[PDB]
Amino acid sequence: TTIMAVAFKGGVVLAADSRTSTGTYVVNRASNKLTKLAEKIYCCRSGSAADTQALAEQTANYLESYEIDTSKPVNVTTAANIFKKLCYMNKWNISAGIIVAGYDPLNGGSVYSIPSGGSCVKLDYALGGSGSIFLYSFFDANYKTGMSKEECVCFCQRAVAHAYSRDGSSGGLIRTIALHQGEPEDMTIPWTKTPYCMEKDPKYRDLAVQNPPFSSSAKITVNQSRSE
Amino acid sequence: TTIMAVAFKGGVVLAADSRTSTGTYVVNRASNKLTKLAEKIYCCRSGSAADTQALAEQTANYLESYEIDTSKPVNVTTAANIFKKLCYMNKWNISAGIIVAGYDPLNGGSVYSIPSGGSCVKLDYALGGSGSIFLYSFFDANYKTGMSKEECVCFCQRAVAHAYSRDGSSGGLIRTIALHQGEPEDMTIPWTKTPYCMEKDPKYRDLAVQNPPFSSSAKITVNQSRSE
Amino acid sequence: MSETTIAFRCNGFVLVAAAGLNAFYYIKIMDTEDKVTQLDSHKVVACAGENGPRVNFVEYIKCNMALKRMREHGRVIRTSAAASFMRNALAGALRSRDGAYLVNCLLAGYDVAASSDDDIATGPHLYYMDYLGTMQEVPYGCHGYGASFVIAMLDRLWRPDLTAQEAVDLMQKCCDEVKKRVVISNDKFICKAVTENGVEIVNTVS
Amino acid sequence: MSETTIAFRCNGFVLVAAAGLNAFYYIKIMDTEDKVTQLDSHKVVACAGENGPRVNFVEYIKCNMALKRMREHGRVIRTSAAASFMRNALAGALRSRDGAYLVNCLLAGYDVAASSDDDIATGPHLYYMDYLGTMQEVPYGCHGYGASFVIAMLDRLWRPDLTAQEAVDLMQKCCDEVKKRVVISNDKFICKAVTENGVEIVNTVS
Amino acid sequence: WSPYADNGGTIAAIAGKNYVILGGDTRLNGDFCIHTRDDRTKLFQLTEHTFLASTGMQADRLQLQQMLKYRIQWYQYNNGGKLPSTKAIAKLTSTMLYQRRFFPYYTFNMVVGLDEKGAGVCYSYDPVGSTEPFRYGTSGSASSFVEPLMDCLLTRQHMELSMTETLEMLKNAFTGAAERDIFTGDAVCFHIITADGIRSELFELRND
Amino acid sequence: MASGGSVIGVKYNGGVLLACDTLLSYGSLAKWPNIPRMKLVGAYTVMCATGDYADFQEMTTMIENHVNRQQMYGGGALTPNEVFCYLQRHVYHKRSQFEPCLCRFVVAGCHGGEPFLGGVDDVGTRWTDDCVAAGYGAYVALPLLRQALEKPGGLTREEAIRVIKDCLRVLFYRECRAINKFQIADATSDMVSIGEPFEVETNWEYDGFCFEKTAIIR
Amino acid sequence: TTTLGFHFDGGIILAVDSRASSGQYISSQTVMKVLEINEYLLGTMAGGAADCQYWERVLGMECRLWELRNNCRISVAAASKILANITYSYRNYGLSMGTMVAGWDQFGPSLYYVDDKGTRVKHELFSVGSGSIYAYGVLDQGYRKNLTVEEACELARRSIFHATYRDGASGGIVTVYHVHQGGWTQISRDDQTKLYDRYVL
Amino acid sequence: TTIVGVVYKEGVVLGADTRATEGSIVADKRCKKIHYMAPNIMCCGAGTAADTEAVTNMVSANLALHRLDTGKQSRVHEALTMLKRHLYRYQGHVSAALVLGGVDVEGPFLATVAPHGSTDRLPFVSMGSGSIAAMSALETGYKENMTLEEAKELVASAIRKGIFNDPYSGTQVDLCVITKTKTELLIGYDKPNERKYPKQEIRFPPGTTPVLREEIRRL
Amino acid sequence: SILTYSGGSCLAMAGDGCFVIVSDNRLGEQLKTISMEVPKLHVINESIVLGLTGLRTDQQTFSEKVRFRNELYKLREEREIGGKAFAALVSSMLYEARFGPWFVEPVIASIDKRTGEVYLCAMDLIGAPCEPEDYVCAGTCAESLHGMCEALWRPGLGPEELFEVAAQAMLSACDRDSLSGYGAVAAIVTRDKMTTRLINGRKD
């Protein structure tokens, strides 16, 4: 799994891959890991599918009740706090890394990270899942604050493509959603139009020379392609 | 540990960090992991210090004898083959990932990777150590064939700085050596002049807001800095 | 299986015998403990196991049988009903929190008519039970390391029409063969008969 | 410790006794095996352990002692030299590939002058050994589960000046107390005396 | 990693007054899959009157077949060109299996052939080589079905066949085994052994 | 512990095809995407394997040297059948010393106008058939190839290529450690050739894969 | 399995059953558990069939060589000693074996027990196997030195019968042998189910 | 076990094989694996048989109560939620995998439920020990807006891959078609494993078995 | 194994308007035999017989609970229970102990009095049923029994012919099993009558 969320000027972008696997076999190649918690607040889910589905549903139930009781739309910080409490009270019996992100008019676009263990950290961007390890350096080199909404969608699509080209446990579609004061905008990129993969990178077109033909010299040239 | 080797037009660059550790304490902050096997052939060593020192020394002994018996300088492929055989015959009792690289006039600049298990692969670049995982994406995005010797030194210095800023098991000096038809050129960069670190990156200057003061609003602003 | 118990029924009686030994690892503390316990006027149970579980199990059965007696005008309960209650207590304990009672029993009784309306077949009965709650009516039966030797002897020599004298002789041969062949010392036996006249000690067996 | 062995020395003799039992788990196969083995005209060893190791160990000691005899004009070897050789074979085996010989021994002998030049102190000797190769000269000693009971009795009743008759009586009380208090049945003992006239069976002990 | 794999399937034989009939199924199973439906490695001819039949691990029966073939070749070179009897091969096999007591072949074997009087005989072995001569036998994944049926129809303790009638009984026993054992199926190769020679025949079974 | 994924092969009327991808992995990491995993042996034979790459390299180097030397020193050119037998005895011997070759092999060739195809596993099990596979190819591809071989007459070269590509397509959809980059070897007319790498066409745009329908909370 | 042997005035009787069981499935009902080593000595098997059969065949080979080199028959004490040395040398290698060895030599009839750890014991009566614990019950009731050959055969037969009727691992056919001065004879073979009908009266 | 479902133009087609095993033995050659949930909703089950049976019966009864209370047709999403909540509480100890399909006022619905309680809504699925083989036919044969006949041929071909290639699946194909107006069960839709050699008949003459005693009773 | 500790086996077969159900007689403690007269069949009413195998303490406990529920059913409902409802009841009682099971494996045979239809069921120890139209088997010699029936059973047998086939299947399988034997008992049930027979077997 590869998940992330990034803040921009006046909102957030969430992004993910679409693969669910038992280790070496793909059970679903088109999962949806961006789960809605309220009109402008979403989470990204990693770890056990069963545990994350169950805690997202419970968090959403509590936010809907709260919103009816106050007659106002909820803030991102309230969703993060409710979710944190469920992750922390159940930490020994679950496998879950969560990112909560969204837009509200008090604080604008906000991103919170809730990793294994149940801590809660407020950031400018967050990464999660098996594929995150491939992206720390990509962001350290190429991320800046103050990107526009279109810059930020394009950047997150590229980041997800890099992680899934190297991580066997990620793959498939790239899903994104952008949350701001207007309406939410979702997008799905198919593998055939991915912005990066190893299979089409020209520096990996020519094969390594592992199988040189039997020769009278120690010079290494080409791979054998036909029987002698 | 972070090690690598990259080919350029007419030679190779090897690079490494300088840290040796027992897990969470640093026993040597200035190790040298680029080990000489012949005048223009070096290896990079990762894993158990004891095992890699012992197999490098044995490989070097055999190359010196071979060179005296033929009266000619040895090829990179011969050093890789000798080293591979020692790694493969002893695979259950050692912890070693090796990179062999060098220059010879028959094949030019060559890079071979010999990971755990004792396989041998001939490539354009190789990565090894705990820190390598942070660099697959950096190379996928920013590496090209046909760089000059000065481009390639600068690129490898930057790559090592990115890996060691994220990996707790790497740190300290960056050591490089460039091998071509002329004389070998070694270089050591101190931490104080590193080309990248998180501590001086402006996007990580401002602290996250984790400790907001007690307030009458749910708006999040700044961290508390003085007692009430 | 450090203590052996033996029983067999013939036409008007049941004989029951058990070894006296109490041990602490490899030390004999005493060899005269009576383990053939009388439950009512015409019933006995012989039990094999550690003192704690054995005594706590037979006192629980005795208490419930005395209660049941006085809420029933003091009438002697049938042997099959006592057997059924014991089996149900052993099986109950197996699935309880405290765990199984580690005891193995032989229950013997002689049924006698309650009144003139009673159409019960009068006679001797013998039931084998184990610590799990298995229960089977049998003509003869045994527990302990000696069991296998004695069972084979009885398969060879037992008949239903043995007289009282032939039966006492046969029980003495059974006890002697346990002493001959079992490493664990079972040097003294206590034996009792159950008949139409009640329960009596047989003194000529040891 | 399923078999008990006892020994004690007084002024002109050593008595040695051992239980006859051979077992297969809980079954007595026989109870008349002789485990007090004669090594030469004036020496015996009593061993406790499984038949395989016991027999292979005493035949190895007997063979080496016979060889040593004929490369020495047939002269009787001293008891301390035989003890020293046994201890060295037990300790050797402990650090060998096949492992320790699991046997515990008591070695007894009566030393007699070789010739007129011999300035050896004549007399009875008794050595305790264990399977590891520990070896100690003692006035009395025991192996097996019964050992602790008998040692305490001998601490209370043994003296160096017991007559032959008092000693045979004392050995019978020791054997009876093993039968009384040890759960594992040791029903028959075989006993031998070592004296200036050689080795003889004592028939009045069992 | 284990050095052992069970590849499945079943063998059976029945002896007559002057023949023996021997059958093995052709499926080779992997882990949760099938490698092929046409393996012929369960039956192996040793002479014109003697066969080896094996179940269990396929790589171990391949080794045992070759070890026997070479000991039998040495016997001919040391005995004037003559071949060993069915009884001589049966004792050799017992001895070879016991000599590997400490890392045993994972195989259930039979030796079948004609004796010296010309009658059929079957020897069945446990994996370290105990055996006895008998009139019928079976081993493998369906053997606990087939064996009680052979006891019923051939000895009749609760109540002389032709070659043709004996072969029909085995066809029916394999058909039943293929319906109820998941590792037995596809086809049976049958060999009929007589003094004259050896006739063969292939018989189809259910493919699921 | 560089390792290779699936391999698949099928016989057609006149030859045999063998296919795999160009990737070596280290655990989940996709480390080298441009590795030729098929190796020519002598004049008539090609092999490939699933599992430990270092063990595949040791074993094939050893067999190739034996085959080239026997020919150079006057003992003729080994056939695919003989090469296969030799491979299997080496794998069984190593299993028997508790030092196993941790690979599963597929071997193909053509000699005498007669095609060969066979597999060997890491305890020494061996078999030959009209279709053979290793890795996830054994669960994913054999069902499809066995159905294509049901038609009477056998496959043409074109039908064989088409069903091989359907198999590679499913491995890319459903095997985690895979890439979309494959080679095919063809043994026919007493020789072997290895093709250039190619990619297959894939479908990602079904209505049932859309963002609204796959959502957990509505 | 059940085997027994005893020594009476007229020689040695041996008797056995014929079942082979893992512990649930019955692999055969016709195993021969008395091994005719040669024509003056017998063995019995209990424990692992293969171990008893192989090493008893080795012992038969050693007895025949002795006879060729020395021109006389080996004694029972030596034969049993050759087998106990073998088992002792393999005492750490996991054999399972419980044999009797019987014969009549120049010192008269002799009966030994030999096991897988090097144990070797000489005595007048033994029973071995999982059914032994039933056979000793009947045998200790009927055994005396002054039995006639016919009485001794009956006692042995009835004892194996009672073991077969109660022990799940014993059954099949009951076989009786008699070891005498002229060598040995097979006295009888009887299905244990036919014997049930003759003893239930 | 092999179980399969697809969505077509107007409905859902579910499929299953019919073998049950214990160990390496075939206990039942014709077990039913397609269970009734509601008039418009069906379920196939893999896993521990008792667990699968218990869960589907409990939810089927709670859906029937809810139709009497509310007066409205059962929704497939409700069934799905009720299954998921029960499975999640037992943390995988109730080991049932299910394929659920049906049709309600919002059109066709197909999903899976894993034993730990996770779900997936998709246009073609497979579960069981034959699931990898069956999924190879689905990925090669599926397309958008299939007719009913194309969809039955595709589900039957996926179940036959399990039958011929997976040792724990076998015997024959059962289908179930679910449309807006009706649910049709087609047991034995395809039988590709008949008898090759006819069963020899083994007659025992009456009186063959020895009897010791006999009692009779009239009813 | 806990299921093989006590011994015993059971089989049932269907015919034309009849069934036959058969059990062995042995009771043991692993390889020791306690008794040779313990059949494992229980008559529930004129139309239904239950066979129980497994650990003997759980056979005795579980059959007593079933007889108690059946007595209360008859007083509440004023009718005898039928075979399909009885098997559903038994399955529900086993699943109630899902996470601490009764170690028993029931076989159930019944005939509908009116129609003449026969119903067979076998269950595992947590209650999963299987309802074939030919035969069901359980116990220590289950694998052998399962194969004997596949070979001898055929459709449409009458009472006497069906009896012969079931007896031969039970005796052949028991002769290859150490833990089941000492003959067998059988019940033959039609609409009109119920017969019971004792079958002679081996004594080992």
Numbering used by the authors:
A (entry chain H), B (entry chain V): 55 to 282
C (entry chain K), D (entry chain Y): 1 to 206
E (entry chain a): 33 to 191, 198 to 246
F (entry chain b): 1 to 218
G (entry chain Z): 111 to 311
H (entry chain I): 67 to 285
I (entry chain J): 2 to 205
Quoted passage from the original study:
The proteasome is a multisubunit protease and a key component of the ubiquitin-proteasome system which is essential for the maintenance of intracellular protein homeostasis. The 20S core particle of the proteasome consists of 28 subunits organized into four rings of seven proteins each. The two identical outer α rings limit entry to the central proteolytic barrel made up of two identical adjoining β-rings.
The 14 subunits of the T. cruzi proteasome were cloned using the biGBac system for Gibson cloning and coexpressed in Sf9 insect cells. The protein subunits expressed from these constructs assembled into a complex that could be purified by nickel-affinity chromatography via a C-terminal His-tag on the α1 subunit. The native proteasome structure was determined at 2.31 Å and the recombinant structure at 2.25 Å. While the resolutions of the two electron potential maps are similar, the clarity of the recombinant protein map was considerably superior, particularly for many α subunit regions, allowing accurate protein model building and confident placement of over 1000 water molecules. There are only a few areas of the recombinant T. cruzi proteasome where the protein chains could not be modeled due to lack of density (the loops of α5 residues 125–131, α6 residues 52–58 and 201–203, and β6 residues 192–197). Where the map density was clear, the amino acid side chains were consistent with the expected protein sequences, there being no sign of any insect proteasome subunits that could potentially have been incorporated during baculovirus expression. There are three cysteine residues which exhibit differences in the native and recombinant maps. In the recombinant map, the side chains of β1 Cys 174 and β6 Cys 227 show extended linear density, while β3 Cys 138 shows extended branched density, suggesting that the cysteines have been oxidized at these positions. However, in the case of the T. cruzi apo proteasome the two equivalent residues (His 233 and Phe 236, respectively) already adopt conformations comparable to those seen in the liganded L. tarentolae structures, which would make similarly large side chain rearrangements unnecessary for ligand binding. In addition, the reliable placement of >1000 water molecules in the recombinant structure is highly relevant for drug discovery, as water molecules often play a crucial role in protein-ligand binding.
